[PDB]
Design a protein around this nucleic acid. Structure first.
Ligand code: MG
Ligand code: MG
Ligand code: MG
Ligand code: MG
Ligand code: MG
Ligand code: MG
Ligand code: MG
Ligand code: MG
Ligand code: MG
Ligand code: MG
Ligand code: MG
Ligand code: MG
Ligand code: MG
Ligand code: MG
Ligand code: MG
Lengths: 271, 77, 149, 104
RNA sequence: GUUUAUUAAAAACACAGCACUGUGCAAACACGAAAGUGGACGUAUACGGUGUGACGCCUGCCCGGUGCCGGAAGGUUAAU
């Protein structure tokens, strides 16, 4: 539920929360937690590889069964929990034998529901089954690229992927960015969309909310000095030059897809 | 590192020469590849990080002839 | 790349043919599968005096086995139990080893590298043709019935 | 309760196990007090216009009085069965039992 | 909020926003002779870059130049 907060302090003026009563106000299921240390955008060399990352609140990793391998044994949804890691919400589930796991939350999913993965699974949001067993056109998410690898497609908070065509050992997938891609017809996928579809509706409001999420301030290019960046310098504001990376590479519209191993799977590029 | 284990081709240095003869230091790199080889004397495969030149050598001398040398050289394979 | 043939191979000739072929077809394929010997002078007269005549015998011990693996494999009523639905709707896809497992239980103790499928998946429950490659010449043809378990 | 009438269009290459589909539906009908009134197979039949790149079909007419919930279940069964191609759900006023003229 | 430790604390910077683009995941990108690592144990409601900088009203015309992007017939054309 979206809530425009009230302008008490300037800094609350534009804060838009996403209120959900479904979020289990408790401590999460401890045997599926593990330490994820921060990095600050620094590799093993200790150089800042990717910029702008650092600080932020301490986060513990949740072990999400993307691979979704319990088959035949049905599940039942214990509760819906917040995830500090990813944008989408997760749900502690429970099988018949006793194992609890986390999965992602589809949009049409509440607590106490029962789901099941397999090949003989029914078709309701929350099942996961290989896409040769799925009707064409039905929107899914959590799509594996290789069979058994674990879903790497439509895994954010408000995504889904449609299955536009099945033919032979391949299925054509309309990606969320609108890019027709073949996938092998044995990859598994989870039916329906994914829960927090209104995650894009939030507004962070103040700059400290950016800093809570580990994102340092981004300095714009043309503020710098010419030694620092190609956009640098200028008596005042001068920008007589083409918009490029700090490493000189053209940015506005210059494509960068160099992977030619996988061109036979892209049916059509995005638009 | 980059060593054709059959021959011994090491990456040697040299120069890139402009048409105005401005020399800059460069390297020359051998065309090494990993490749399995059907050692029929044991009926199995041995991988060797080998240049394409040594592939002709195994095509000329035979693989057990070459493996005699690296046992004689003592280089593990 | 001169090479002598340990067996008759289709697009280049019979046994005992010292043919120049390309390197990759010799090095990666014929030699490691043992279908040929590189025509070295130590192997020429090793072949031409001995294995030009030894392999004439050593091909007949396999060619006599060639008629066996289709003659006894003429029962053709191979039954595979597999879960499915209605008007087909198969649960689990029939694999090559699964066909190499029931025929293993009746007739040739057959390998996973013998099942040559024109179809592969075999979705619909019912009869399905299965070809065999027990030798490069003669093929065994068994139309296996898939049975809805 | 709610008198319905179901006719549906089975793919003619699936005409072999249509009474397999009929009687399981008939069991699913009568499993919830389903007052079946007629149960009529029409066999293969030429289409007036070719749906789905083919010209024959397989038609089964069926009068059913039933509660609505098992019918909506059955509606989804036609939706994912690809043996059936098209289906029809018509809310009938009463328990029609008289055979159609095109049964002949 | 931040900044020229030590002649400048602001209108400078950042900012939440907004927009462009790039990016199908072995992602783009960066550090790296390399393996690798960050990216991210994340997957387009994500990530990177660039722009302007809340909110409000807005955001007109020009593709000639210059970049960018697409089209391949032809012309041109390297080593070969
Ligand atoms: Mg960034
Ligand atoms: Mg920004
Ligand atoms: Mg800035
Ligand atoms: Mg300055
Ligand atoms: Mg510069
Ligand atoms: Mg000026
Ligand atoms: Mg000099
Ligand atoms: Mg102040
Ligand atoms: Mg400071
Ligand atoms: Mg000072
Ligand atoms: Mg200070
Ligand atoms: Mg001062
Ligand atoms: Mg990386
Ligand atoms: Mg500005
Ligand atoms: Mg062009």
């Amino acid at each position: 539920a979206v809530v425009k907060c009230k302008p008490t302090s300037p800094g609350r003026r534009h804060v838009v929360k996403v209120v959900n009563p479904e979020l289990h106000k408790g401590k999460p299921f401890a045997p599926l937690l593990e330490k994820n240390s921060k990095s600050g955008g620094r590799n093993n060399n200790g150089r800042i590889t990717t910029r702008h990352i650092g600080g932020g609140h301490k986060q513990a990793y949740r072990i999400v069964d993307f691979k979704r391998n319990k088959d035949g044994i049905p599940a039942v949804v214990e509760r819906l929990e917040y995830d500090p890691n990813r944008s989408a919400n997760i749900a502690l589930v429970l099988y018949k034998d006793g194992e609890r796991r986390y999965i992602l939350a589809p949009k049409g999913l509440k607590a106490g529901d029962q789901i099941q993965s397999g090949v003989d699974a029914a078709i309701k949001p929350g099942n996961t089954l290989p896409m040769r067993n799925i009707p064409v056109g039905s929107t899914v998410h959590n799509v594996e690229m290789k069979p058994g690898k674990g879903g790497q497609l439509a895994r954010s908070a408000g995504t889904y992927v449609q299955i536009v065509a099945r033919d032979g050992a391949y299925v054509t997938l309309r990606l969320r960015s609108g890019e027709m891609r073949k996938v092998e017809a044995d990859c598994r996928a989870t039916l329906g969309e994914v829960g927090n579809a209104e995650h894009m509706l939030r507004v962070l409001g103040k700059a400290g909310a950016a800093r809570w999420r580990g994102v340092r301030p981004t300095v714009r290019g043309t503020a710098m000095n010419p030694v620092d960046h190609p956009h640098g310098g200028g008596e005042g504001r001068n920008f007589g030059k083409h918009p490029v990376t700090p490493w000189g590479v053209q940015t506005k519209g210059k494509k960068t897809r160099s992977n030619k191993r996988t061109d036979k799977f892209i049916v059509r590029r995005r638009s | 590192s980059r060593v054709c284990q059959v021959t011994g081709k090491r990456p040697v240095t040299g120069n890139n020469r402009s048409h105005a003869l401005n020399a800059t230091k460069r390297r020359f790199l051998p065309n090494l590849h990993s490749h399995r080889f059907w050692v029929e004397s044991e009926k199995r495969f041995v991988t060797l990080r080998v240049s394409a030149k040594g592939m002709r050598v195994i095509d000329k001398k035979g693989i057990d002839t070459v493996l005699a040398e690296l046992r004689a050289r003592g280089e593990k394979y | 790349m001169q090479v002598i043939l340990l067996d008759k191979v289709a697009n280049l000739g019979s046994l005992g043919d010292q043919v120049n072929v390309k390197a990759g077809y010799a090095r990666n394929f014929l030699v490691p599968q043992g279908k040929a010997v590189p025509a070295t002078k130590k192997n020429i007269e090793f072949f031409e005096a001995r294995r030009a005549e030894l392999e004439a015998k050593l091909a007949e011990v396999l060619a006599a086995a060639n008629a066996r693996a289709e003659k006894i494999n003429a029962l053709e009523t191979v039954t595979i139990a597999s879960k499915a639905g209605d008007e087909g709707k198969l649960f689990g896809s029939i694999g090559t080893r699964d066909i190499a497992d029931a025929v293993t239980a009746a007739g040739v103790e057959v390998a996973k590298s013998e099942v040559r499928l024109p179809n592969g998946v075999l979705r619909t429950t019912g009869e399905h043709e299965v070809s065999f490659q027990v030798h490069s010449e003669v093929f065994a043809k068994v139309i296996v019935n898939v049975v809805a378990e | 309760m709610r008198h319905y009438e179901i006719v549906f269009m089975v793919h003619p290459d699936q005409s072999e196990q249509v009474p397999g589909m009929i009687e399981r539906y008939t069991a699913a009908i009568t499993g919830a007090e389903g007052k079946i009134h007629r149960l009529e197979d029409w066999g293969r039949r030429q289409l007036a216009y070719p749906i789905n790149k083919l010209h024959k079909a397989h038609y089964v007419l069926m009068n059913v009085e039933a509660p609505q919930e098992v019918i909506d279940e059955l509606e989804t069964t036609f939706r994912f069965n690809d043996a059936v191609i098209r289906s029809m759900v018509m809310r009938t006023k009463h328990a029609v039992t008289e055979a159609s003229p095109m049964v002949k």
